[PDB]
Design a protein around this nucleic acid. Structure first.
Lengths: 149, 83, 129, 185, 83
RNA sequence: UUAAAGUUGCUGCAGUUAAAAAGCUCGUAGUUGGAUCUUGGGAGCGGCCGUCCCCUGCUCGGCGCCGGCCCGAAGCGUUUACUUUGAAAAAA
RNA sequence: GAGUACACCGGAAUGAUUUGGGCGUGCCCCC
C-alpha cells in the first residue's frame, strides 16, 4: 500500500508489450531532442516535458525513439539542475506548510503532515546521499527556506 | 505395492475419481459409479457395452459435477465439440 | 511487501491443488522456480506446464494432475551437509518410499536422491510429496 | 566490392556472387540515392530440413537502421534474382562469455546471450512484428518457443515460417514455431 | 470453474478484466488524430490529453482536460491509428 | 535435577471471549528484501539415454619431430559466504 | 506555391505519347 496513507491504490501507467517506433509518425531523433532542449530552455520539469511531447507531438515514449530518457539527455548536455525535481517539490511543499503553520499556530493536522513530509524528505535524502548525487554533508534545515526554494 | 517376490500384497485396489484424480475411500457415501450408454452406430439402438464414470464427494459437495460430466463425455466423444 | 517469490508460488500451488483447480497462474517469475517446476514435472507430479514471456516479469501456467499432496518451502535458506540430510528427511518427509527435498547444490537446483549420489550438499529450498 | 570483412580473408565465391547481384541491382534500379555506405559483412547458404534452400545475409548492427528503408524492395529483388531461395537480414552481434569467478573489462548487457538471441529473433521476421512470445516446457525438458506474429502484413508470411524455424534451429538450436492470433487485432 | 482456459481466453473477458490483471498487460488508451473544418493544421492527440491543447499555429481550441478521456469540440472528426 | 513439559515451543506454544496487541502515527539502531548476465552439440561405449573428453593466458626449461607445436613450469589471474576432500589436532 | 476541392514539374508505363486531388495508408473531399 501507500507509505504514509492507510489506503491501497492500484492506478498507474501500463506499458504495452510492443517494442517498436510506430510507423504512423515519421520523426527523427535529433529534431525531437532539439524540441526537448527548447522546452527545457523554456524552464520546465522533465515530467512536464514528457507530458507535453506525448500530448502534442504524438511520440509515445522517448526511450523507444531514442537511446536515452529525458534526464540522461539533460545531464549529457548540462541543463539538468543539481537539485532533483521531486526533492525540490518536497522542499517547496515543506516551505509552504511551514509558512502556513507560522501564520496559523493552533493546528495539529498540518503539524502532523509536516512531520510526515519531513520524514519523507529525510528518507529520500538518504537515498540521494548514497547514490552520490547530493553532497554528503548536505542537510535540510527548517530555517533554510530561502536558499533553494 | 509390489514386492521382491513379484507378488502384490494389496488386499483390494481402491478406485479413483475420473475428474480430480482423487481416491474414494471405504466409508464415503457421496460417490457414484456412473454408467453412460452409447448409441448403436446405424440408426438408434442400444449395443450393450458401457461407458462408465466415477466421481468423489468433494466435487459434488462444491457442486462442479455437471462440468466434470461434460468434460468426460466430451473427452470420450459423446458430446460434440461445438456444444 | 513480497520477500519470498518462491514461497508465494509454492503456497499458491498448494491452495489451488488442495481445492482441485486443474491449472493455475503465478504472478512473478524466477529462474529457480523454473528449475523447481522442471524437477517437479520430471518426477511426474506435474503435467505439461506453460510459462509466458512478457517484458516485465513472467507468468507461469501449471496444469495439475492431482498426484501432488503438499509442496512447501523452508525459510530462511539454511545449509545442510551430507551428514545432516538424514535428520531433515526424517523430520520433514511423510515417509521414505516417496517425497523429495530439493536443495541448491554446486551443480544447480536438484533433488536430494541424486544429491546423495553426487556427494554434494548446500543450501535448502523446500520439499514436496 | 561492397563487402568489408573484419579480417582480411578471402571467402568462397558465393558472397562474391551476392555482391555482384547487389551491384547489378544498384546499377539497374533507381537505388543509387540510398546505397552509399551499405557494406555487407558476410553471407551463407543453408538448407532447411526439407526440399528448399534459404540464404542468410549478415549485416552490421548500426547499419541496419538504414536498412529499415530498403527491405521492402531489396527482398523482392533478391527473390526474383534467386527464385528458389529466400533472403533475410540478420544483424551481426557477438556473444561474450560469462565473467566466471575463476576469470578485463565489464560485459555490457547489449552483448549478452539473451540480448543477442532476442535481437536475432527480432530481426528474422521483419515485415510482420512480434505480438507475444510463449515458451512451452516438454516432458524431455526441451524448451519450445512459440511466438505470435502480427495480423498486419499477413499475406507475405504464411510460406516463410518453416524457413524461419529452420534458420533459428540451425543457428541457435531452439525449436521455434509461429502462430497468428486474431482475437486482438 | 475447475478449469478455466487462461492460455487463450475470449477477448470479451480480456476487456472485462483490468488493464493489469490481463494475461499480458495492455493499456486501454490509444493515439488519435483530429482536424478542424475551419482550418488546415492537423495534430495527433492522445486519448487522455491531460491539458488544453492548442492548434499548431494558434487557431482553435481542440480538447478540454477532464478526469479521463478528453472531450473534443463539435464538428471535429477523429480516427485512431495502429501498427 | 532430568525425561514426561508441544506447561519456555529453533524443530515445536498462545494473544476476540480461558493468562495475553502498547490509544495512534512517525522514526535512528536491529531483521528481512522484486526480475534479470551461458545456451548447446560431436566421435564412441549400445540396442533416445545411464558412463567419459572439449571450447582467460604470456619469462626459465625436457618426451620428440623437420629456426615453428601440447609441454615441466620460478612469476601472476578482484574480494566473501556455502559445501566435499587433506593435514594438525594428548590419553582415558 | 495559400496544399479542404488546386496551378507547375522531375522519375516512370505503352522513334513517339501519357493516368482527380489530401496526408490522418486508409477513408475523406470532386465527379
Amino acid at each position: 500500500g501507500r507509505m504514509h496513507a492507510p489506503g491501497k491504490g492500484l492506478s498507474q501507467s501500463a506499458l504495452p508489450y510492443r517494442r517498436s517506433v510506430p510507423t504512423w509518425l515519421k520523426l527523427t531523433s535529433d529534431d525531437v531532442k532539439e524540441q526537448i532542449y527548447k522546452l527545457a530552455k523554456k524552464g520546465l520539469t522533465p515530467s512536464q516535458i514528457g507530458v507535453i511531447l506525448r500530448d502534442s507531438h504524438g511520440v509515445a515514449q522517448v526511450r523507444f525513439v531514442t537511446g536515452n530518457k529525458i534526464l540522461r539527455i539533460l545531464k549529457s548536455k548540462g541543463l539538468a539542475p543539481d537539485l532533483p525535481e521531486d526533492l525540490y517539490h518536497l522542499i517547496k511543499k515543506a516551505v509552504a506548510v511551514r509558512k502556513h503553520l507560522e501564520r496559523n499556530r493552533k493546528d495539529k493536522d498540518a503539524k502532523f503532515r509536516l512531520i510526515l513530509i519531513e520524514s519523507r524528505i529525510h528518507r529520500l535524502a538518504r537515498y540521494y546521499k548514497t547514490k552520490r548525487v547530493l553532497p554528503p554533508n548536505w542537510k535540510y534545515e527548517s530555517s533554510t527556506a530561502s536558499a533553494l526554494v | 505395492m509390489q514386492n521382491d517376490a513379484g507378488e502384490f500384497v494389496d488386499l483390494y485396489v481402491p478406485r479413483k475419481c475420473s475428474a480430480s484424480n482423487r481416491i474414494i475411500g471405504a466409508k464415503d457415501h457421496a460417490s457414484i459409479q456412473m454408467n453412460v450408454a452409447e448409441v448403436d452406430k446405424v440408426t438408434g439402438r442400444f449395443n450393450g457395452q458401457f461407458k462408465t464414470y466415477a466421481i468423489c464427494g468433494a466435487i459434488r459437495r462444491m457442486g462442479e459435477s455437471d462440468d466434470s460430466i461434460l468434460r468426460l463425455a466430451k473427452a470420450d466423444g459423446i458430446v460434440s465439440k461445438n456444444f | 511487501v513480497r520477500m519470498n517469490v518462491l514461497a508465494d508460488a509454492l503456497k499458491s500451488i498448494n491452495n489451488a491443488e488442495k481445492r482441485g483447480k486443474r491449472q493455475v497462474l503465478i504472478r512473478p517469475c524466477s529462474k529457480v522456480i523454473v528449475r523447481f517446476l522442471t524437477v517437479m514435472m520430471k518426477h511426474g507430479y506435474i503435467g505439461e506446464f506453460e510459462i509466458i514471456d512478457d517484458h516485465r516479469a513472467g507468468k507461469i501456467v501449471v496444469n495439475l494432475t492431482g498426484r501432488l499432496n503438499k509442496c512447501g518451502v523452508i525459510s530462511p535458506r539454511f545449509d545442510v551437509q551430507l551428514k545432516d540430510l538424514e535428520k531433515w528427511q526424517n523430520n520433514l518427509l511423510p515417509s521414505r518410499q516417496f517425497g523429495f527435498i530439493v536443495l541448491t547444490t554446486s551443480a544447480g537446483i536438484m533433488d536430494h536422491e541424486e544429491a546423495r549420489r553426487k556427494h554434494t550438499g548446500g543450501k535448502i529450498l523446500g520439499f514436496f510429496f | 566490392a561492397k563487402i568489408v570483412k573484419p579480417n582480411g580473408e578471402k571467402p568462397d565465391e558465393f558472397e562474391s556472387g551476392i555482391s555482384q547481384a547487389l551491384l547489378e541491382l544498384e546499377m539497374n534500379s533507381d537505388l543509387k540515392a540510398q546505397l552509399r555506405e551499405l557494406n555487407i559483412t558476410a553471407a551463407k547458404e543453408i538448407e532447411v530440413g526439407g526440399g528448399r534452400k534459404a540464404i542468410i545475409i549478415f549485416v552490421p548492427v548500426p547499419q541496419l537502421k538504414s536498412f529499415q528503408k530498403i527491405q521492402v524492395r531489396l527482398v523482392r529483388e533478391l527473390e526474383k534474382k534467386f527464385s528458389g531461395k529466400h533472403v533475410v537480414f540478420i544483424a551481426q552481434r557477438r556473444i561474450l562469455p560469462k565473467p566466471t569467478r575463476k576469470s578485463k573489462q565489464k560485459r555490457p548487457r547489449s552483448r549478452t546471450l539473451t540480448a543477442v538471441h532476442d535481437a536475432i529473433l527480432e530481426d528474422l521476421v521483419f515485415p510482420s512484428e512480434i505480438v507475444g512470445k510463449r515458451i512451452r516446457v516438454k516432458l524431455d525438458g526441451s524448451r519450445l518457443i512459440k511466438v505470435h506474429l502480427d495480423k498486419a502484413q499477413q499475406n507475405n508470411v504464411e510460406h516463410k515460417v518453416e524457413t524461419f524455424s529452420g534458420v533459428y534451429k540451425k543457428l541457435t538450436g531452439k525449436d521455434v514455431n509461429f502462430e497468428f492470433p486474431e482475437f486482438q487485432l | 470453474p475447475l478449469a478455466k482456459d487462461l492460455l487463450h481466453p475470449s477477448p470479451e473477458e480480456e476487456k472485462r478484466k483490468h488493464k493489469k490483471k490481463r494475461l499480458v498487460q495492455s493499456p486501454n488508451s490509444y493515439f488519435m488524430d483530429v482536424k478542424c473544418p475551419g482550418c488546415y493544421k492537423i495534430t495527433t492527440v492522445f486519448s487522455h490529453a491531460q491539458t488544453v491543447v492548442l492548434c499548431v499555429g494558434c487557431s482553435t481550441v481542440l480538447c478540454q482536460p477532464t478526469g479521463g478521456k478528453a472531450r473534443l469540440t463539435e464538428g471535429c472528426s477523429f480516427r485512431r491509428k495502429q501498427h
